[PDB]
Structures are given as C-alpha cells and as structure tokens.
Amino acid sequence: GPTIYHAKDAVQTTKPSERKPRLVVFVVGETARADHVQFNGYGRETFPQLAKVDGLANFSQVTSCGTSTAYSVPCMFSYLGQDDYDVDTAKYQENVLDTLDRLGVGILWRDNNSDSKGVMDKLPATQYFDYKSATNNTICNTNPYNECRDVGMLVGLDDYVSANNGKDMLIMLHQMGNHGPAYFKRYDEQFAKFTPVCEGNELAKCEHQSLINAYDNALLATDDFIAKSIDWLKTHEANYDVAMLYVSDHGESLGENGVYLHGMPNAFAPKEQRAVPAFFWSNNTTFKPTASDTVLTHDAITPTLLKLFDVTAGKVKDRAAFIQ
Ligand SMILES: [Zn+2]
Ligand SMILES: [Zn+2]
C-alpha cells in the first residue's frame, strides 16, 4: 500500500520569512553509554571539551528504543514510539524528516556509520551522502587504517547553508562514534589518552581495564567532534538561530556478566545497552532545554525536532521533549 502518514496535520507556526531562520545539527551518536559520561557520574573525564561549553545541557535519564543501529535509528525518527514501533515496516511510514521536508525545512544526512537504516529512503537522493569513504569524506588520511573520521562530515557544510540560505535547515551527522569491536581504530592518536589499550577486534580476549580504556579514548574523539560541530554552528549565528542535538542510538556491554557489544533483544538486554547520553546546545534562549533529569527515551526525539522548527502535530503533542 501507499506510505502510511502520521502527521498530515503538521503545521509550521512561524516561518523563516517572519523570524530568524534556524540551523540545527543532529549528531546521531553510536554505541555511547550514559554511564561513561562524567556528567552522569563516570569517574573519568571523557567529555572535557563539552564540559567547558557554556549552555551545553546534558540529559542524565535517557534510554534508547533498542540496542542496535538497525533497530534504534528508524525508531528515533518515528512517529510511533518504541512500544508500537515495527522495525519491519518503519521504512513505509511517514517519519519526522518527511514531515519537515514537506513543510519546507532543508534536510541533509551525511553518514559515517553505515546508512540511514531506511529513514532517508523517500527523500531525494541529493539529500543523503555516504561519508564512510574518501569519495566524499576529506578526512580519512589522519590514521594508518585510512578510516574516515566524523569531523570530515563538517567540511563543506557552508556550501549547503549558502545553497539554502534563509531557509530552516536540519543536518543529520550519523557518526561512527564508539562502534566496535575495534575501538582502538575509532580515534586518531591525539585521543589516545588512557593506557593500556586493547588492540584487537575480539573484545572477549581483552583485559578489562584495557577494554575500558580503548572505549573511553573513542569517547574523547566524540567529545571533540561534538565540540567542533558547535564551533561550526557558531560561525552561522549572525544569520541563524543555531542548535545542536546529540543522542546515542544505544549503549554497549563491556564484559559485564560476560556480555560484549550490543544488539540483544530489549526483553533481555542489560541496562548498559539502553542507557544513552544526550546533549543539547543552542546559541540563545529561542530554545530552552527541559530539566536535565527528566526521564526520557528516544520517543522524545521526534517532538524535539518538530519543536525546533515550530511545527505542531497531533500525534506527538503531549510527548515530553528535550526542549520546552
Ligand atoms: Zn552495531
Ligand atoms: Zn548503533
């Protein structure tokens, strides 16, 4: 049958013709655990750069829709919520990006992870780019693995802003982040702060502290990427109200009870695979975060993205969001 719509009643209550246009980067994070962020109680400073950003909000009580990228990513952009979510048919539902595009918001998705897991499939091919290879990513030569880096997704974004100047814009950066098993490959060597590091692709053969250290070094690289994304947004704050939303797609098991990696069914998965960090920053009070300890899930993402662009829609109007 046809695409199943959920927000045909969506309306944008203020337009970029009547107020300052809005430019948002949504970092779609990867494999990051809430309990390895110092803001949430971790006894190591894994986010030192974000710790120094004025106006950076951290959300300490967020849990994911699921435990893998294929499962969680479509749910993050869904109208259905985790309880009604069906991974098999998510591709055939109107999602929040479809709504925003229909209402005139520019949508761009750069992917240094895998792909959009069906989220971008109805939208024009010109709105999605594979940043896992040097065909598009200019930052793949900073490490001996030739692995393309998340910071490469920021290069050239000014051309996109110029081509859509004066419109509202939402840019998804799907980062490699902390995906394993080979955490040691996920960061350039200026982030090799904690030692010893487990150097291999079979984590069950790692000594425990060396496994943690490799994982935490990868978090330092993500701290840096998010900080640089905020720096990029700041270069546009004269002409746009700017904001950055970060949410990880799921956590990671690090050997607790013999469990590694992620992907367990929600009915069985340990809390480590579900408790995820989330951050929000904006340049001014056009947006206001909700309380940092609000109990939230991935169901909060769709209403947040709508609120960022002053869009209302009946399907999610009583949902808690990351902003007021
Ligand atoms: Zn995975
Ligand atoms: Zn993932």
Cα three-residue angle 30-174-308, rounded to 5 degrees: 105
Q: Find out whether 130 and 111 touch, Cβ atoms under 8 Å.
A: yes
Which neighbouring-strand residues pair with 62?
296
* 89 known member of a binding site: no
* 208 known member of a binding site: no
Q: How far is the CA of 267 from the centre of ligand 2 (A)?
A: 18
Q: How far is the CA of 67 from the centre of ligand 2 (A)?
A: 7
Q: How far is the CA of 179 from the centre of ligand 1 (A)?
A: 6
* 286 known member of a binding site: no
Q: How far is the CA of 183 from the centre of ligand 2 (A)?
A: 13
Burial 50-72 (b: 16+ CB within 10 A, else e): beebeebbbbbebbbbbbbbebb
SS3 43: coil
DSSP strand pairing (311-312 vs 11-12): antiparallel
Look at domain 1-324 and name its CATH class.
alpha beta
The first and second tokens of residue 231, run together, are 């720096």
The structure tokens 């998965």 sit at 269
Ligand closest to 30 (CA) is: 2
Q: Per DSSP, which regions of the chain are E strands? A: 11-12, 22-29, 57-59, 62-63, 106-111, 128-130, 169-174, 241-248, 253-254, 260-261, 278-282, 296-297, 311-312
Task: Name residue 261's amino acid.
Answer: L
Q: How far is the CA of 93 from the centre of ligand 1 (A)?
A: 23
Closest CA to 48 of 222, 254, 277: 222
Query: Can you tell me the distance from the alpha carbon of 176 to that of 56, in angstroms, rounded to the nearest whole number?
Result: 22
Task: Name residue 239's amino acid.
Answer: N
The structure tokens 């949410």 sit at 247
Q: How far is the CA of 164 from the centre of ligand 2 (A)?
A: 30
Instruction: Look at the alpha carbons of 280, 285, 288, 293 in this order and tell me if their dihedral is positive or negative.
Output: positive
Query: Can you tell me the distance from the alpha carbon of 80 to that of 38, in angstroms, rounded to the nearest whole number?
Result: 32
Ligand closest to 276 (CA) is: 2
Q: Find out whether 86 and 4 touch, Cβ atoms under 8 Å.
A: no
**Residue 234 CB neighbour total at 10 angstroms:** 13
Helix and strand element counts for the chain (H, E):
6, 13
* CB-neighbour burial class of residue 144 (10 A; exposed 0-12, middle 13-18, buried 19+): exposed
The first and second tokens of residue 48, run together, are 């030192």
* CB-neighbour burial class of residue 267 (10 A; exposed 0-12, middle 13-18, buried 19+): exposed
Residues 6+ apart with CB under 8 A from 95: 74, 77, 78, 79, 119, 302
Residues 6+ apart with CB under 8 A from 134: 140, 141, 146, 148
**Residue 29 CB neighbour total at 10 angstroms:** 26
Ligand closest to 66 (CA) is: 2
The structure was resolved to a resolution in Å of 1.1
* 249 known member of a binding site: yes
The answer for 177, left when phi > 0, alpha when psi is -120 to 50, beta otherwise, is: left
Q: How far is the CA of 239 from the centre of ligand 2 (A)?
A: 34
Query: Can you tell me the distance from the alpha carbon of 182 to that of 198, in angstroms, rounded to the nearest whole number?
Result: 9
Q: Where are the alpha helices (DSSP H) in the chain?
A: 69-76, 81-84, 96-102, 157-163, 208-234, 301-308
Ligand closest to 249 (CA) is: 2
Q: How far is the CA of 71 from the centre of ligand 1 (A)?
A: 10
